[PDB]
Amino acid sequence: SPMYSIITPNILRLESEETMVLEAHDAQGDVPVTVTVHDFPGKLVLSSEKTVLTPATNHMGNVTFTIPANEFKSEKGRNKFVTVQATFGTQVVEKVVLVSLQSGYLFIQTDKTIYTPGSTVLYRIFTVNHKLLPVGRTVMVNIENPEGIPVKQDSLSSQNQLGVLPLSWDIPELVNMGQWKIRAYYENSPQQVFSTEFEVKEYVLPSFEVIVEPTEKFYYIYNEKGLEVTITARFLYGKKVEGTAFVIFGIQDGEQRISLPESLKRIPIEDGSGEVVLSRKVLLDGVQNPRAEDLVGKSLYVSATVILHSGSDMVQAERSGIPIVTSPYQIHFTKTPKYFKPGMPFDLMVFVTNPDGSPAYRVPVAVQGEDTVQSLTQGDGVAKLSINTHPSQKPLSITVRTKKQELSEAEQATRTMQALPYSTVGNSNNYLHLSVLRTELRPGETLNVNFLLRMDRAHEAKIRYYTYLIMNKGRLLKAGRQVREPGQDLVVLPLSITTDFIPSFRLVAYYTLIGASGQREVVADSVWVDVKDSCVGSLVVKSGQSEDRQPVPGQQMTLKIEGDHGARVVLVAVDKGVFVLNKKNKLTQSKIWDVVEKADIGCTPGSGKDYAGVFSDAGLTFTSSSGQQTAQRAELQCPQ
Amino acid sequence: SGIPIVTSPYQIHFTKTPKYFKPGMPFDLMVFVTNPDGSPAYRVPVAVQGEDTVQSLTQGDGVAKLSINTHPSQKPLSITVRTKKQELSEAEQATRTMQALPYSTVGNSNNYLHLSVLRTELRPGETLNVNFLLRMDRAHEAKIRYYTYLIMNKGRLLKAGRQVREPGQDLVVLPLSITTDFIPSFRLVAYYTLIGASGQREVVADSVWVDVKD
Amino acid sequence: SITTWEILAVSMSDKKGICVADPFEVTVMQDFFIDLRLPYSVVRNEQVEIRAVLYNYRQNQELKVRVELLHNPAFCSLATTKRRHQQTVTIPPKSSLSVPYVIVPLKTGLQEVEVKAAVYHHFISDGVRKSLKVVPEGIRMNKTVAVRTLDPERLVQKEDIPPADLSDQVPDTESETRILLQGTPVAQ
Amino acid sequence: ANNHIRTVLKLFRTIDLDDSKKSFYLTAAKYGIQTQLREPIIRIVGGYLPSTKLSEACVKNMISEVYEIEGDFYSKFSYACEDHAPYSVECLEDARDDYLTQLVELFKETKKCLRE
Ligand SMILES: *[C@@H]1O[C@H](CO)[C@@H](O)[C@H](O)[C@H]1NC(C)=O
Ligand SMILES: *[C@@H]1O[C@H](CO)[C@@H](O)[C@H](O)[C@H]1NC(C)=O
Ligand SMILES: *[C@@H]1O[C@H](CO)[C@@H](O)[C@H](O)[C@H]1NC(C)=O
Secondary structure (H helix, E strand, C coil): CCCCEEECCCEECCCCCEEEEEECCCCCCCEEEEEEEEEECCCCCECCCCEEECHHHCCEEEEEECCCCCCCCCCCCCCEEEEEEEEECCEEEEEEEEECCCCEEEEEEECCCEECCCCEEEEEEEEEECCCCECCCEEEEEEECCCCCEEEEEEEECCCCCCCCCEEEECCCCCCCEEEEEEEEECCCCCCCEEEEEEECCCCCCCEEEEEEECCCCEECCCCCCEEEEEEEEECCCCECCEEEEEEEEEEECCEEEECHHHCEECCECCCCEEEEECHHHHHHHCCCCCCHHHCCCEEEEEEEEEECCCCCEEEEEEEEEEEECCCCEEECCCCCCEECCCCCEEEEEEEECCCCCECCCCCEEECCCCCCECCCCCCCEEEEEECCCCCCCCEEEEEEECCCCCCHHHCCEEEEEEEECCCCCCCCCEEEEECCCCCECCCCCEEEEEEEECCHHHCCCCCECEEEEEECCEEEEEECCECCCCCCCCEEEECCCHHHCCEEEEEEEEEEEECCCEEEEEEEEEEEEECCCCCCCCCEEECCCCCCCCCCCCCCCEEECCCCCCCEEEEEEEHHHHHHCCCCCCCHHHHHHHHHCCCCCCCCCCCCCHHHHHHHHCCCEEECCCCCCCCCCCCCCCC | CCCCCCCCCCEEECCCCCCEECCCCCEEEEEEEECCCCCECCCCEEEECCCCCCEEECCCCCEEEEEECCCCCCCCEEEEEEECCCCCCCCCCCEEEEEEEECCCCCCCCCEEEEEECCCCECCCCEEEEEEEEECCCCCHHHCCECEEECECCCCECCCECCECCCCCCCCEEEEECCHHHCCEEEEEEEEEEEECCCEEEEEEEEEEEEECC | CCCEEEEEEEEECCCCCEEECCCEEEECCCCEEEEEECCCEEECCCCEEEEEEEEECCCCCCECCEEEECCCCCCECCCCCCCCEEEECCECCCEEEEEEEEEECCCCEEEEEEEEEECCCCCCEEEEEEEEEEECCCCCCCCCCCCCCCCCCCCCCCCCCCCCCCCCCCCCCCCCCCCCCCCCCCCC | CCHHHHHHHHHCCCCCCCCCCCHHHHHHHHHHHHHHCCHHHHHHHHCCCCCCCCCCHHHHHHHHHHHHHHHHHHHHHHHHCCCCCCCCHHHHHHHHHHHHHHHHHHHHHHHHCCCC
């Protein structure tokens, strides 16, 4: 009784290439296959892209199609579904999948970050699709007042513009101040909107940047020395500043800011560096709660005002978010799988972070039990830990604690997790572990997964291959077999990681046997791998000259751009005084990758309650003619 | 001096590859692609002659981690490593062959041990996870409870320990703390011991060479 | 402008993807230069102070600047088409200096202010022309003319909005009137 | 030196551009010449021994070429530019780039006059 399976992304998209991997396990001879998609309910958006399966490919194929968007725009407030009904020879299998309206991203770039009234606004609107490629679509833009009333409306097409839409606006003279907003959204999907904020203010450009970085990015509550903050001031163009600097400290809880009257100090800066300390007596007396412990959680904030001895220019710089904490580390379980397998290593990805949020570097972690295990964090703040598991059904209570030296035991950071066992089909004890290296992988270097297996010797001849899939950015990227000769128990599959795998790929896998009374079963696994976040291509700007540095104003210089052939670059030069005055709402690769990762369908970093759970966690939909099919999804976001 | 006149821009070396393997279990090839003068080649796509769809890319230090599975057979295994860099004619690719004989058990009892391990430029301080992979039929699986391991560094037993293995599992991961005492290499040996056949004592061992950044 | 430009490049390639280069900074700087300091706006007929800040970045050379405020028909200051305003100052090395100027704006619009230097015994100069806004004395207030609800059947509907009084409007000042239309959705 | 400096400055006062032309154009042209052809020249000349002699002949050729180059820039700004309205600031900005480019080319070529 051969099976026929369809594996498709859990939520479909409009006007994009969506892949549906087709397998026919234990099938003899060629089988025609036709895939048709119909609207749900009712009945034919597309019925094209049929295929012929051959044993030359080991009976595996993929059918890619792009569903037209039309019936789709009539109703949007309630989720809409489509039915993917495919016929394998004379056997028909169908599955209802959700369809989203999101079709691409709009990254808005404004040249400056603060404008004065009577000055023109120059901004661009990049148009890219889910795969980060230029697309031709129609956009709408509305520029909002501080109160939120549109002031300008426009419609543009990205056709033949290579995904860049330069635009303009001349700010009216009589306008309200404060944050403005620019909201742009694709014309087909008006319920998803992207935005940026630019500030209209009365300003004249400053002359020098003031940096306040405390010695530690926190304040120990029991430290008797007080907060140690260093104020440094350098001119814009690279010279040291002489002046006098006022500073002040306060306690920032929730949204109310209270200042410390006994804290303002004048600390003259010589050679552009000054240091002031907030004695703990001041901190305790300023607040009305003498209990020092009850002050934890609240954040300090440093407001530094610098004036030159000329007295001609004044600049303000503020560093907030200095958390008052009793422990310098915060242990997170965001990346650790929440489900494990009996009798396998259970790789823990602990994420040791500083109290502010930045990743921690070179900190030893340990497990409270079996203290013989100890590790040390990598560059990105993830420490690989391995805990062997007894073959038992009881939930495993894993607690991890930081064991840094020269830190008192009443001062480390602790955390606890509950991990539940993978549940087989009818207690058959047929699992699959998929061991792998997880590090700051760079594109190009290979990876060796370990298709580890565990099953009784009575059924070691039925399994001869391992199917695997690779999610990335929301669509299947690669899908192939992995042959394994019977009698072999570990299989290493070399994976060629190109630059196309940025930033993460959710490798899955499965096999299929018949056992017990002769009922079909499926066993799956998942792995989340984090790749270093950089371009899929490469671009960098440097200077043509190799001599006679510090160009004088009015002098030609040549800047060299080393970009990929055929590409198009867009340039902008901003005075650094603007960033001194307001450094928020910039654009960089980090935010682009954050936005792309925030839209991934998968919603758990690997493993699951069982095979249906594993597939839904990955963001897939595995249905078969026999009946073993994944659970239905009808919500855009997985539960928090 | 030393500008060599050559007809091939790369030279494939098998200095670091183990010369013996285990039947039916992974065998890790460590090719050492080098420039004709002797410097380590960087970012060269090397591949095995058979199943040309498998290939890798050499890391910075000059070794490319290629893994090729093995059939459970006693016949000698032949490896034909063959670089396939682009912008080079097929007459320009450097080639090399090797023969690796199989591990021989005691009395053909089919007992093996394998220490699968990460192979990069380890830096002292970070941890390495070794996989004490075992192969044994369920006839005598209750007789093994631990794996003894030893560390050889600069001609001394750096750290000899144990690894308890609760019977019922066939893979256990032993975390190693790679301090600065491990410069530059350590030969992690391991073994167990059981009563097999008609009551004859026997021991099964393995070893791994790990290169740490110098 | 003597500052540090930050140049950002964003790629849009058809086949590969999208890139954003790390910002590249070129630090424009001169040996001896003026950095005139102006407020954003100075109210008409009210006296304000303008500072010219002269910099000298020779390691061990004392400098002898001769600053000067050219006459402008808009403002009012000591400069005149017959007599010129010159301070002959001395700048110690690696040191700043500040020169005070008092100017009374006289007419509205955007007006320019310039100072011209000329080093002695060497031949070096630098003058800066900066423009600052001048506005008539007053404050920004926005009185609501009227609010009304449109209902063609409960009130067609012929509606007229009388012009506002503008009793306190400052003369020769533009006034903007904004009209907003929003519907009233009903449900249930 | 100093006598050489006085001679060179006395020479860059003979230069004349038409007064009837627009004020911002005059400022643009004068600033271009003053920053690309009078600062490096004055810097180069300052580093001469007093006994060394200049060669004002092709310095007068410098002046002839700067008249011609300013004339070409003015012609390109007035009516040659077509993407924008005549006598408009964006035409000025578009033409100023290549004006300064040919001007620095002239200066680089004429750096050999300053000695015999
Ligand atoms: C199916 O996936 C393979 C992965 O190697 C790819 O080469 C092929 O183009 C895909 N099929 C289609 C129709 O795109
Ligand atoms: C034996 O080896 C261990 C390795 O950890 C070492 O700590 C110990 O000092 C050695 N000697 C004795 C007597 O334990
Ligand atoms: C007038 O302007 C203010 C800005 O301060 C803003 O609340 C709104 O636009 C108007 N408010 C009133 C009460 O007129």
